[PDB]
Coordinates of C-alpha atoms and ligand atoms in Angstrom, one line a residue:
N11 CA -17.4 4.5 15.7
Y12 CA -16.3 3.8 12.1
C13 CA -18.3 3.7 8.9
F14 CA -17.7 1.9 5.6
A15 CA -19.9 0.6 2.8
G16 CA -23.1 2.0 4.3
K17 CA -22.5 0.2 7.7
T18 CA -21.3 1.7 10.9
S19 CA -19.5 -0.5 13.4
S20 CA -17.9 -0.5 16.9
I21 CA -15.3 -2.5 18.8
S22 CA -17.9 -5.0 19.7
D23 CA -18.1 -6.3 16.1
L24 CA -14.3 -7.1 16.0
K25 CA -13.7 -10.8 17.0
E26 CA -11.8 -10.8 20.2
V27 CA -9.4 -13.7 20.4
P28 CA -8.6 -14.9 24.0
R29 CA -5.1 -13.9 24.8
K30 CA -4.4 -17.5 26.0
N31 CA -4.8 -18.7 22.4
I32 CA -2.1 -16.4 21.0
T33 CA 1.6 -17.4 20.7
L34 CA 4.3 -15.2 19.3
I35 CA 7.0 -16.9 17.1
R36 CA 9.1 -14.2 15.5
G37 CA 9.8 -10.5 15.2
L38 CA 9.2 -9.5 11.6
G39 CA 9.9 -5.8 11.4
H40 CA 9.1 -2.4 12.8
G41 CA 6.7 0.3 11.8
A42 CA 6.2 4.0 12.5
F43 CA 6.6 3.0 16.2
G44 CA 4.8 -0.4 16.6
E45 CA 6.0 -4.0 16.0
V46 CA 4.8 -6.9 13.9
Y47 CA 5.3 -10.6 14.8
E48 CA 4.6 -14.0 13.3
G49 CA 2.0 -15.7 15.5
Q50 CA -0.2 -18.8 16.1
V51 CA -3.8 -19.0 17.0
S52 CA -5.1 -22.4 18.1
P60 CA -3.3 -24.0 14.4
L61 CA -3.6 -20.7 12.4
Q62 CA -0.6 -18.8 11.1
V63 CA -1.0 -15.0 11.7
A64 CA 0.8 -11.7 11.8
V65 CA 0.4 -9.8 15.1
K66 CA 0.6 -6.0 15.1
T67 CA 1.3 -4.8 18.7
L68 CA 0.4 -1.6 20.4
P69 CA 3.2 -0.6 22.8
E70 CA 2.1 -0.4 26.4
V71 CA 4.2 2.8 26.6
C72 CA 1.7 4.9 24.6
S73 CA -0.7 7.8 24.8
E74 CA -4.5 7.8 24.7
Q75 CA -4.6 9.1 21.1
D76 CA -2.5 6.1 20.3
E77 CA -5.0 3.8 21.9
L78 CA -7.8 5.0 19.7
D79 CA -5.5 5.1 16.7
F80 CA -4.9 1.4 17.2
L81 CA -8.5 0.5 17.7
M82 CA -9.6 2.5 14.6
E83 CA -7.1 0.6 12.4
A84 CA -8.7 -2.7 13.5
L85 CA -12.2 -1.4 12.6
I86 CA -11.0 -0.1 9.2
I87 CA -9.3 -3.3 8.0
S88 CA -12.1 -5.5 9.4
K89 CA -14.7 -4.1 7.0
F90 CA -12.8 -4.7 3.8
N91 CA -13.7 -7.9 1.9
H92 CA -11.3 -8.1 -1.0
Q93 CA -8.5 -10.5 -2.0
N94 CA -6.0 -7.7 -2.6
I95 CA -6.4 -6.3 0.9
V96 CA -4.9 -8.1 3.9
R97 CA -7.5 -9.8 6.0
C98 CA -8.0 -9.0 9.7
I99 CA -8.4 -12.2 11.7
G100 CA -9.4 -10.7 15.0
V101 CA -8.0 -8.7 17.9
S102 CA -6.8 -9.3 21.5
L103 CA -7.5 -5.9 23.0
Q104 CA -8.7 -7.0 26.4
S105 CA -5.2 -7.9 27.4
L106 CA -2.0 -5.9 27.3
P107 CA -0.1 -5.4 25.0
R108 CA -3.1 -5.0 22.6
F109 CA -2.9 -7.1 19.5
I110 CA -4.4 -6.9 16.0
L111 CA -4.3 -10.3 14.2
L112 CA -3.8 -10.1 10.5
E113 CA -3.2 -12.3 7.4
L114 CA 0.4 -13.4 7.2
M115 CA 2.2 -12.4 4.0
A116 CA 5.2 -14.7 3.7
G117 CA 6.6 -12.6 0.8
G118 CA 7.2 -9.6 3.1
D119 CA 6.8 -6.0 1.9
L120 CA 7.0 -5.2 -1.8
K121 CA 9.8 -2.6 -1.6
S122 CA 12.2 -5.2 0.1
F123 CA 11.1 -8.0 -2.2
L124 CA 11.9 -5.9 -5.2
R125 CA 15.3 -5.0 -3.9
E126 CA 16.1 -8.5 -2.6
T127 CA 15.0 -9.9 -6.0
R128 CA 16.7 -7.5 -8.3
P129 CA 18.0 -9.8 -11.0
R130 CA 21.7 -10.6 -10.5
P131 CA 24.4 -13.0 -11.7
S136 CA 14.3 -14.9 -11.6
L137 CA 11.8 -12.0 -12.2
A138 CA 10.2 -11.0 -15.5
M139 CA 8.2 -8.1 -16.7
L140 CA 5.0 -10.1 -16.4
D141 CA 5.6 -10.6 -12.6
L142 CA 5.8 -6.8 -12.1
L143 CA 2.5 -6.3 -14.0
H144 CA 0.7 -8.8 -11.9
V145 CA 1.8 -7.0 -8.7
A146 CA 0.7 -3.7 -10.3
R147 CA -2.6 -5.3 -11.4
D148 CA -3.1 -6.8 -7.9
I149 CA -2.6 -3.4 -6.1
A150 CA -4.7 -1.7 -8.8
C151 CA -7.5 -4.2 -8.1
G152 CA -7.5 -3.3 -4.4
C153 CA -7.4 0.4 -5.1
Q154 CA -10.4 0.0 -7.3
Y155 CA -12.3 -1.8 -4.5
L156 CA -11.4 1.1 -2.2
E157 CA -12.5 3.7 -4.8
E158 CA -15.7 1.8 -5.5
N159 CA -16.4 2.0 -1.7
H160 CA -15.3 5.6 -1.5
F161 CA -12.3 4.8 0.7
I162 CA -9.2 7.0 0.1
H163 CA -6.1 5.2 1.2
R164 CA -3.8 8.3 1.2
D165 CA -0.5 6.3 1.3
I166 CA -0.3 4.0 -1.7
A167 CA 3.4 3.1 -1.8
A168 CA 5.5 -0.1 -2.1
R169 CA 6.4 0.0 1.6
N170 CA 2.7 -0.5 2.4
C171 CA 2.1 -3.5 0.1
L172 CA 2.7 -7.2 1.0
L173 CA 3.1 -10.4 -0.9
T174 CA 1.6 -13.8 0.0
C175 CA 4.8 -15.6 -1.1
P176 CA 8.1 -14.7 -2.7
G177 CA 7.9 -17.4 -5.4
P178 CA 5.6 -17.9 -8.4
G179 CA 1.9 -17.3 -7.8
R180 CA 2.5 -14.5 -5.4
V181 CA -0.4 -12.1 -4.8
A182 CA 0.2 -8.5 -3.8
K183 CA -2.2 -6.8 -1.3
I184 CA -2.5 -3.5 0.4
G185 CA -1.2 -4.2 3.9
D186 CA -1.2 -0.9 5.9
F187 CA -3.8 1.7 6.6
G188 CA -2.1 3.9 9.2
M189 CA -2.5 7.1 7.1
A190 CA -6.2 6.8 6.5
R191 CA -6.6 6.1 10.2
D192 CA -4.6 9.2 11.2
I193 CA -7.1 11.4 9.2
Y194 CA -10.2 9.6 10.5
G202 CA 2.1 14.1 12.2
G203 CA 4.1 16.8 10.6
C204 CA 5.7 18.2 7.4
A205 CA 8.9 16.2 7.5
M206 CA 6.8 13.0 7.9
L207 CA 4.4 13.6 5.0
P208 CA 4.9 11.2 2.0
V209 CA 5.6 14.2 -0.2
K210 CA 7.1 12.1 -3.0
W211 CA 3.8 10.1 -3.4
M212 CA 1.4 13.1 -3.3
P213 CA -0.1 15.2 -6.1
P214 CA 0.0 19.0 -6.1
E215 CA -3.5 19.7 -4.8
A216 CA -2.7 17.4 -1.8
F217 CA 0.5 18.9 -0.5
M218 CA -0.5 22.4 -1.6
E219 CA -4.2 22.5 -0.5
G220 CA -4.6 19.4 1.6
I221 CA -7.2 18.1 -0.8
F222 CA -7.6 14.3 -1.0
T223 CA -9.8 12.3 -3.3
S224 CA -9.7 9.0 -5.2
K225 CA -7.6 10.9 -7.8
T226 CA -5.0 11.4 -5.0
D227 CA -4.6 7.6 -4.8
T228 CA -4.4 7.6 -8.6
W229 CA -1.3 9.8 -8.5
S230 CA 0.2 7.7 -5.7
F231 CA -0.4 4.5 -7.7
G232 CA 1.6 6.0 -10.6
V233 CA 4.5 6.5 -8.2
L234 CA 4.1 3.0 -6.8
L235 CA 4.1 1.9 -10.5
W236 CA 7.5 3.6 -10.9
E237 CA 8.7 1.9 -7.7
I238 CA 7.7 -1.5 -9.1
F239 CA 9.4 -1.1 -12.5
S240 CA 12.5 0.6 -11.1
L241 CA 12.7 -2.6 -8.9
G242 CA 12.6 -0.8 -5.5
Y243 CA 14.3 2.5 -6.1
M244 CA 13.3 5.6 -4.0
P245 CA 11.2 7.9 -6.2
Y246 CA 12.9 11.1 -7.4
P247 CA 16.2 9.4 -6.4
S248 CA 18.6 12.3 -5.9
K249 CA 15.9 14.9 -4.9
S250 CA 14.8 15.9 -1.4
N251 CA 11.2 16.4 -0.3
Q252 CA 11.1 20.2 -1.0
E253 CA 13.0 19.7 -4.3
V254 CA 10.3 17.3 -5.4
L255 CA 7.5 19.7 -4.3
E256 CA 8.9 22.5 -6.5
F257 CA 9.8 20.1 -9.3
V258 CA 6.3 18.6 -9.4
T259 CA 4.3 21.8 -9.0
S260 CA 6.4 23.3 -11.9
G261 CA 5.3 20.3 -14.1
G262 CA 8.3 18.1 -13.7
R263 CA 7.9 14.4 -13.7
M264 CA 10.2 11.4 -13.3
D265 CA 11.9 9.7 -16.2
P266 CA 11.0 6.1 -17.0
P267 CA 12.6 3.4 -14.9
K268 CA 15.5 1.7 -16.7
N269 CA 14.1 -0.5 -19.5
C270 CA 10.5 0.4 -18.6
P271 CA 8.2 -0.3 -21.6
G272 CA 6.5 2.7 -23.1
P273 CA 3.0 1.4 -22.5
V274 CA 3.9 1.1 -18.8
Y275 CA 5.5 4.5 -18.5
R276 CA 2.5 6.0 -20.4
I277 CA 0.3 4.7 -17.5
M278 CA 2.5 6.5 -15.0
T279 CA 2.3 9.8 -16.9
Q280 CA -1.5 9.5 -17.1
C281 CA -1.6 9.0 -13.3
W282 CA 0.5 12.1 -12.9
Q283 CA -1.7 14.5 -14.8
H284 CA -1.6 17.9 -13.0
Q285 CA -5.4 18.3 -13.0
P286 CA -7.0 15.4 -11.0
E287 CA -9.9 15.1 -13.5
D288 CA -7.5 14.4 -16.3
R289 CA -6.2 11.4 -14.3
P290 CA -7.8 7.9 -14.8
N291 CA -9.8 6.2 -12.2
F292 CA -8.7 2.7 -11.1
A293 CA -11.1 0.8 -13.5
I294 CA -9.2 2.4 -16.4
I295 CA -5.8 1.8 -14.8
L296 CA -6.6 -1.9 -14.5
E297 CA -7.9 -1.9 -18.1
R298 CA -4.6 -0.5 -19.2
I299 CA -2.5 -2.7 -17.0
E300 CA -4.3 -5.8 -18.5
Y301 CA -3.6 -4.4 -22.0
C302 CA 0.1 -4.3 -21.0
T303 CA 0.1 -7.9 -20.0
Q304 CA -1.3 -8.7 -23.5
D305 CA 1.5 -7.0 -25.4
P306 CA 4.4 -9.4 -26.2
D307 CA 6.7 -6.5 -26.8
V308 CA 6.0 -5.4 -23.2
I309 CA 6.2 -8.7 -21.3
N310 CA 9.3 -9.9 -23.3
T311 CA 11.3 -6.8 -22.2
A312 CA 14.3 -7.8 -20.2
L313 CA 14.8 -6.4 -16.7
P314 CA 18.1 -4.7 -16.0
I315 CA 20.6 -6.6 -13.8
Ligands
VTA1 C1 0.2 -7.4 8.1 C2 1.3 -8.4 7.7 C3 2.6 -8.2 7.7 C4 3.3 -9.3 7.3 C5 4.8 -9.5 7.1 C6 5.2 -10.8 6.8 C7 6.6 -11.1 6.6 C8 7.0 -12.4 6.3 N1 7.4 -13.4 6.0 C9 7.5 -10.0 6.8 C10 7.0 -8.8 7.1 C11 5.7 -8.5 7.3 O1 5.3 -7.2 7.6 C12 6.4 -6.3 7.9 C13 6.2 -5.3 9.0 C14 6.2 -4.8 7.5 C15 5.0 -4.4 6.7 C16 5.2 -3.9 5.5 C17 4.1 -3.4 4.7 C18 2.8 -3.5 5.3 F1 1.7 -3.1 4.6 C19 2.6 -4.0 6.6 C20 3.7 -4.4 7.3 F2 3.5 -4.9 8.6 N2 2.4 -10.2 7.0 N3 1.1 -9.7 7.3

């Protein structure tokens, strides 16, 4: 079973789509080890996450749980789950298609060159902050807030960013070299403690990813170097051209004591105040 928002659910509640109704159009990218495709359902445009047939039994239940988790969110900044095709092999999860791709790539592919403005970055930040607030309000801890796990509806104007992957929260419902150490607060990678204030810290790092335009956090540092850097009180410098009000949100997210970090209602509040400052949204992005 899986529980969320006071309700417990099982596989039966997922809407099973007859395999005959599903057509694969494109490969779209890889994952930890599974694949994602562009797909049709008779005609609806979907993304299809596939479970390799060459997989263990823990994998089986991992894949099922992810479907249950995503199915019980009802929020515009969290990708929708359209159904499943689990009674045929390979097993499918049908998901909202995000034509903008992942946020990390979009930021790198869109880095102004010989297009974007500060306000577009704030809306992406606001979008993800809105979803995180919905998760916190419902007592869901994502554990892996990061640009690679966010998607965009479209690359152009009017894009909406949404949280698009929940593999981490499913794993705790693989190893040290696989932990997202660069997105985790001290109490997390030191004690294994996880709360909504853990996602708060991660969002601050995501915020740095957004306003660096897709850079890797702690650019020249390794995982262990970041662990010693952060535990000692070290923090990243502002991204190039980052407005103070935006950097000041990152630093509040990175408070050493979780209970000096803001919740996601306050982060939204402060992001919205940033969209209201001309001196912020008129700041030029670096080329
Ligand atoms: C669920 C879903 C994926 C997509 C999707 C669309 C396009 C288009 N054009 C290109 C890539 C897409 O995902 C690729 C696998 C990587 C990914 C990143 C972050 C995530 F959070 C989840 C992901 F799968 N649309 N919907």
